[PDB]
Amino acid sequence: TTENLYFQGSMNIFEMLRIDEGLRLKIYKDCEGYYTIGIGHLLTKSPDLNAAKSELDKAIGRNCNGVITKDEAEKLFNQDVDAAVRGILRNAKLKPVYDSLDAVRRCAAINHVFQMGVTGVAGFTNVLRMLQQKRWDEAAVNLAKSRWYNQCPDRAKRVITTFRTGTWDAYKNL
């Protein structure tokens, strides 16, 4: 479809993570129980809500009282995406795999690091080798064994499908 052919140009890392993480203007606990706000911004792993609000005020730069605006959520979101990209490119293990990937799977790579962090992703020794060798089906099967996926499948299922196919299909028809 001419509409189907345009959907590609509408999808990017920002729209991808926006779907996987949602958009919340108030502090909430994610599927792992950690305090979160905005578009998947983990505030802290501490169970103390007071620590979550203290980190929020530091990140936004004002007395937020646990609430932020949509424009603030986007600014924080852009910083987190940049941090995940920079984390990949300076890492001697992730950068060669990332460089080998196509544009769409590169988005899935940034997404993965955004969710898990650099050392967590860099620990997927076998998945990283499979991806560099273009063994897409095997990579997706091994990702489906991870604790990252199995503890919170809805946040990870679309990333795994994107690693398998290199298309945006899993983000169609929400």
CA-based nearest residue to 161, from 152, 149, 91, 151: 149
The two three-digit tokens of residue 122, written as one number: 């860099």
Q: How far apart are CA 163 and CA 25, in angstroms?
A: 30
Query: Active-site residues: which are they?
Result: 21, 30
Residue in the structure block whose two tokens are 């009282």 = 65
29: left (phi over 0), alpha (psi -120 to 50) or beta: beta
CA-based nearest residue to 154, from 70, 12, 40, 37: 40
